[PDB]
Write a protein that binds this ligand. Structure first.
Ligand SMILES: *CC(=O)Nc1ccc(NC(=O)C*)cc1
Ligand SMILES: [N]
Lengths: 17, 114
């Protein structure tokens, strides 16, 4: 699911920031 | 049914060299940028986010900024091509490409670094 992929990249990036 | 394939699911590479792992996705006649979603990740790090022709560099993990590179020329050819310049030991692990082009599928590639 490409929508699911966007959510995980958003969460993980937000965590690294 | 849309299926992603990989030529090699194991890459053995030398430390400090360049590498390009590939994910092949079905493209027919022309590429529709407005319909392609491509994702690259390894372990718990974002590498590439490229959604309908827009690449977001803010989401890319810091250890891959200035080294990680998606060769968009190959996209017209149906090839998701991840280029990492000057690979490190930390670049070893399980990689994953995620493509959406109509349907959606993913495959995994192991990268080992000598
Ligand atoms: C589905 C989705 O968009 N999830 C999501 C997760 C994280 C964030 N941003 C932060 O966590 C900072 C946005 C959206
Ligand atoms: N932060």
């Amino acid at each position: 699911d490409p929508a699911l992929w966007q959510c995980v990249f958003a969460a993980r990036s937000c965590y690294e920031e | 049914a849309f299926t992603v394939t990989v030529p090699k699911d194991l890459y053995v590479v030398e430390y400090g060299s360049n590498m390009t792992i590939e994910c092949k996705f079905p493209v027919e006649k022309q590429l529709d940028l407005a319909a392609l979603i491509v994702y690259w990740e390894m372990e718990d790090k974002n590498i590439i986010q490229f959604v309908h022709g827009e690449e977001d560099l803010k989401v890319q993990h810091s250890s891959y900024r200035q080294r990680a590179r998606l060769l968009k020329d190959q996209l017209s050819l149906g090839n998701a091509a991840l280029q990492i310049t000057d690979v490190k030991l930390q670049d070893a692990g399980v990689y994953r490409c995620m493509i959406s082009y109509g349907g959606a599928d993913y495959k995994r590639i192991t990268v080992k670094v000598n």
